[PDB]
Design a protein around this ligand. Structure first.
Ligand SMILES: OC[C@H]1O[C@H](OCc2cn[nH]n2)[C@@H](O)[C@@H](O)[C@@H]1O
Ligand SMILES: OC[C@H]1O[C@H](OCc2cn[nH]n2)[C@@H](O)[C@@H](O)[C@@H]1O
Ligand code: CA
Ligand code: CA
Ligand code: CA
Ligand code: CA
Ligand code: CA
Ligand code: CA
Ligand code: MN
Ligand code: MN
Ligand code: MN
Ligand code: MN
Lengths: 230, 232, 231, 231
């Protein structure tokens, strides 16, 4: 079973398993039950910005989500990621739909990892995605090319999102993300678009065991990240 | 009077004005009396590294100081830099000797400011220093091009440091370091070599962020580290 | 008098002084008579891209000028920058109108110096009203739509003729040493040239000069804020 | 059979097959018979620096090899990389010994790819024993002194003859696209060739190939871990 650290963008509140009563960002450590959340005033059809940061000094996992000329949502939680995750990881985005649905649409994604024993580094930047985007490991329903974006869940030829969908995008190379100062910054832009009165289920940035894969039946409320609601 | 934010690498305990009784790091917000500090087992004649970090999400100004295969010292303080400094700053290193002295030798320095409204960026890297290093503003006793290093304080033609010295290096361009921001952030690193014949060296190195038009105050040698008008 | 290396987005054919008959890109080495040019189908009112590059191994100053979904214009030229420019320089953008006019809005500017390692990078995506890390010379202003207008624009948003302005980055840039294994720079910028005139004038240039460089008195029109005369 | 573009640090003159009469650097386009070479005074037991660069505007593959306080060696050649290599590639270092031998230890390695923007950068300043973001192939090991040993070294530190290894970075790299205003890469690395032989052999190269690229069976000695034969 995979070991998951994730920052979630949770559009659909599953109160029966812990979610607050509103859309919300939060920090997920080994569980879909967030260890901390904030209210996230999601904006249908609006392109948004997510930034995630962590360093081995403060060991504060932190993230912002915003739309232009609006109040951001902010969440942060103390984690020694070197204690929780393995030496090598992969970095990625995940998303899912259920009974309810939305487009889970990635217009850009960037990452920068620095380790200082002295310094090793990795950086990659996606402002567009192509149909055969060979430096991404695409899993589940994830495609690229159309147009020219990364789409995590299923969406029709005219742009209409489909329920009970799950997909992930992992950058191809593993990342050394702690050694016995270190830091990483992740940035992405997303476009959640839904005809439903309630959209679902949300996007996530995650860091996993190198050989992580979507768990069986992880559509909907489990975001492509988790075996179960535990 | 200049508005100073600083990370200090304090070699000489001046306990008459607040210092703990050991070499320490600390965070300096508008005062030479640190808001917080930690024990910095300084190593004489050893080349060490310093890394300073800050962001507008956590607003926690933090710094590490370390010598190869040894324990680093750590210090961090919660600070909304937008609330203390002006929009435009300049960023710098400073150092000072007094009765006691040391080489305050800079072997490398780097900086990265990111501000996201979207992104504006600033980076500069110094692995060596020429004699006419036109992108620094040298104040007081600071020279460049001996080895290819920045020397914040006075040192002889054969490398021997001198008492009652004070000097500063500042990068030429001013820096946007907060907007009214999705996220802002900066990282600063430098490598130093402190070397002294004294049994106690003094007074320390600082990394500093100031009003653009800041300079060394009158008589800020010693415990005042080139940064502060007074011991208040 | 200044030492100027410039790449020029020349919108107005001043054939009297060697311009081709059409709008051109061009490389400018101590003279407004470009040492080399190529043809640039400048699209009026379109945001374009430009990239400028050089290394001390090949010593080829090169430039691309582009509009989404159309063929780029390309120009390149062999010059030892160290034998022309002084050890320290400043970097900038310049623009001029004359009898005819155009807006010279800049939407973005970037730069990277490597000297081999010493390094320098700034990215401007948007410009504030008090953009303190830029030296503004002449008619140049910042803040309006968050951009850099090199030349004067009225409050109707329309361009005034016979104007000249420049933005230089505040920090001096070390652009060659005698002891370099490699040295290199990249410069990139986006612009927008909006003219109600039949023929817009006069163009944009990215430039590297002596640190103390200033707008040559009279440098409007064909002279692009760079050169005192047309020699 | 693999598609190979390489810049070769050729320590041994295999004159039988077009090597010059001295150690050289050189650009290898689908052949071990370098298209272009320059003389390189390789210094035994000393750390050196190699820089490799290309952009799609100039279409000029150039390379610099240097030692502190000695004249650099320089080589350069005109190739439209996109007419040679496929859309996607992997990047790497290769090395070989044959009858005579040298250590081929890499102290650091960097790379930057820019596609107009899509980008990729990695910096290796040190190599742990389980360096999972490198594909190791043949005799190559990591960790010992925190370094990358392309070829076999004994437990006394001595270089073994007739050896071959390669380090490819694990992520595919997109090194051209038909819709590129500008694409470019740079690669830097530091090496240390230590040989007790009168004549060290065979050399190090930085290479770009088809993503599925493998060591050619028998590619030791003069063939650098890159080419099936000397054709
Ligand atoms: O602004 C365009 C040009 O206007 C003026 O020249 C007009 C002209 C061209 N041929 N005959 N008259 C001058 O100001 C030039 O310097 C400008 O380039
Ligand atoms: O290792 C150096 C070379 O050794 C072998 O060739 C020996 C030789 C050359 N001329 N006469 N004998 C082969 O393995 C070559 O491929 C190597 O370059
Ligand atoms: Ca949910
Ligand atoms: Ca003190
Ligand atoms: Ca160290
Ligand atoms: Ca003209
Ligand atoms: Ca374009
Ligand atoms: Ca050979
Ligand atoms: Mn949730
Ligand atoms: Mn103190
Ligand atoms: Mn012209
Ligand atoms: Mn050869």
């Amino acid at each position: 079973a995979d070991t998951i650290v994730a920052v979630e963008l949770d559009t659909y509140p599953n109160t029966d398993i812990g979610d607050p009563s509103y859309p919300h960002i939060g920090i997920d450590i080994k569980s879909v039950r967030s260890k901390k959340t904030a209210k996230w005033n999601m904006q249908n059809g609006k392109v948004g910005t997510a930034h995630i940061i962590y360093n081995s000094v403060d060991k504060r996992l932190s993230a912002v989500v915003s739309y232009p000329n609006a109040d951001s949502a902010t969440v942060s939680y103390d984690v020694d990621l070197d204690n929780v995750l393995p030496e090598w990881v992969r970095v990625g985005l995940s998303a899912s739909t259920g009974l309810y649905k939305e487009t889970n649409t990635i217009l850009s994604w960037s990452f920068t990892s620095k380790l200082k024993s002295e310094t090793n580094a990795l950086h990659f930047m996606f402002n567009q995605f192509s149909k055969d985007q060979k430096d991404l490991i695409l899993q589940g329903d994830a495609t690229t090319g159309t147009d020219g974006n990364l789409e995590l869940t299923r969406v029709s030829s005219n742009g209409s999102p489909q329920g009970s969908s799950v997909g992930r995008a992992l950058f191809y190379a593993p990342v050394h993300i702690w050694e016995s100062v270190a830091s990483f910054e992740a940035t992405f832009t997303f476009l959640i678009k839904s005809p439903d009165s309630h959209p679902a289920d949300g996007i996530a940035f995650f860091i996993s065991n190198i050989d992580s894969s979507i768990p069986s039946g992880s559509t909907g409320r489990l975001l492509g990240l988790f075996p179960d609601a535990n």
